[PDB]
């Protein structure tokens, strides 16, 4: 479909086009500043993915349970009957909570891994 | 505690605040040059971590043994009775040796992995 072609498709359809858009995030003092800022934004998103334990991944699973209050919808009405723009709006008030939990979860897992590697 | 809040704490206490400071490494020609240089330094540190086999990790274990001459202290007097600034000063003369060994260790392991994947 091309860049943003899946924007109007359902979440479970648009989830198969992640590489199409990922490849378009990287591809006159004000223009140079714009390029530097675009690089900084890319690196900040990559840093967030790294902190959560998701390095070379576009889809990564975590150990943070869904708390229902964030969204109490069925899977059959999110992935099959909703777009990513609608979902993003629906949980825009909770994105700074979930991310914090994700960071804490990785911090515990990373330390646990170290302890499992210290058993002779 | 916040950014650098653990600077005066022991190594085994400050090791639990790595995400707090990692998130603060990314967050007018001279100012643009300063921003580009900050990005270059970030990428050089990430490249060193990648070469050593540590990608999306803040704590990673290696196969290089401690050679004692670098520091012959007990674990009980490093992690419990020392700060990271004191440790950094103590081994500042050896950081270019350890890193070299780390690169060599990964080079051997990476090749070994390839050979283990060529056995039918």
């Amino acid at each position: 479909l091309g860049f943003l072609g899946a924007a109007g498709s359902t979440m479970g359809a648009a989830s198969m086009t992640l590489t199409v858009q990922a490849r378009n995030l990287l591809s006159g003092i004000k223009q140079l500043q714009a390029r530097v800022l675009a690089v900084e934004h890319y690196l900040r998103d990559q840093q967030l993915l790294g902190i959560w334990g998701c390095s070379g991944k576009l889809i990564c699973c975590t150990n943070v349970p869904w708390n229902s209050s964030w969204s109490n919808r069925n899977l059959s009405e999110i992935w099959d009957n909703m777009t990513w723009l609608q979902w993003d709006k629906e949980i825009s008030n909770y994105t700074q909570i979930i991310y914090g939990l994700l960071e804490e979860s990785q911090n515990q897992q990373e330390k646990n891994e170290q302890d499992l590697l210290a058993l002779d | 505690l916040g950014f650098l809040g653990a600077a005066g704490s022991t190594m085994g206490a400050a090791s639990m605040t790595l995400t707090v400071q990692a998130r603060n490494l990314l967050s007018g020609i001279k100012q643009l040059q300063a921003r580009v240089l900050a990005v270059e330094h970030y990428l050089r540190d990430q490249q060193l971590l990648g070469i050593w086999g540590c990608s999306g990790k803040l704590i990673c274990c290696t196969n290089v043994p401690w050679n004692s001459s670098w520091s012959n202290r007990n674990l009980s007097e490093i992690w419990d009775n020392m700060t990271w600034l004191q440790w950094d000063k103590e081994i500042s003369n050896y950081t270019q040796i350890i890193y070299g060994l780390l690169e060599e260790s990964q080079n051997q392991q990476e090749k070994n992995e390839q050979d283990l994947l060529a056995l039918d």
Partner: antibody, heavy 123, light 109 residues
């Protein structure tokens, strides 16, 4: 100065359950790994379970792996062990012990250090 | 399980040894062979940790060593008050953590 005092129930019927606990004092609870060891009335000592200092990692002997749960609360300085099914072969004096594991940044243990008074569980 | 003699004895002032044997995958593979003294009616207390190390507060009459796939505890200067069942234990691995032997009854003449 280290005091480990076991509490919990005594005799239960086969198929029941018991929650045992251990109160610790005299040392920093959160700084040491903890474990449970049992001794049948006519036998020697047998290791049953091990929990690390942060409570995140638990290990069991295969004979209890699917039946016993070990947990700790570092703010209450309290351990607990919840046993399900309760088989005839589980009759023993259970002891609370400090040691058996370390956390990579501490020196190695691989031994049990402090032992509690012990409590007898029968089926 | 580890194998120990069921009984050891000697006269006061003499030394005695208590053996502990296993296999090459457990007692022979890791140098973590501890010993405990369990007085009748009491909980076991730590006497030896590591292969050769003693806890602080324990008398220097208790020592030990290992060779091959075996280990032993040596009690020098045996006293009339050393009435206890002695146990050996060792770290086995990341699947099976600790293995204990049977108790050895120490009789002091």
């Amino acid at each position: 100065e280290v005091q480990l005092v076991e509490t919990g129930g005594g005799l239960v019927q086969p198929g029941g359950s018991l929650k045992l606990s251990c109160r610790a004092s005299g040392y920093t609870f959160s700084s040491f790994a903890m474990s449970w060891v049992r001794q049948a009335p006519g036998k020697g000592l047998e290791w049953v379970s091990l929990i690390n200092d942060r409570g995140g990692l638990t290990f069991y002997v295969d004979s209890v792996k699917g039946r016993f749960t070990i947990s700790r609360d570092n703010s209450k300085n309290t351990l607990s062990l919840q046993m399900h099914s309760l088989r005839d072969g589980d009759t023993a004096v259970y002891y609370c012990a400090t040691g058996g594991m370390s956390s990579a940044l501490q020196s190695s243990k691989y031994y049990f250090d402090f032992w509690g008074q012990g409590a007898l569980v029968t089926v | 399980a580890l194998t120990q003699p069921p009984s050891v004895s000697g006269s006061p002032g003499q030394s005695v040894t208590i053996s502990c044997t296993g296999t090459s995958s457990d007692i022979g593979s890791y140098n973590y062979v501890s010993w405990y003294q369990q007085h009748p009616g009491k909980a076991p207390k730590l006497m030896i940790y590591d292969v050769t190390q003693r806890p602080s507060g324990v008398s220097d009459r208790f020592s030990g060593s290992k060779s091959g796939n075996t280990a032993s505890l040596t009690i020098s200067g045996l006293q009339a008050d050393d009435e206890a069942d002695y146990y050996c234990s060792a770290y086995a691995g990341r699947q099976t953590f600790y293995i204990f032997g049977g108790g050895t009854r120490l009789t002091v003449l």
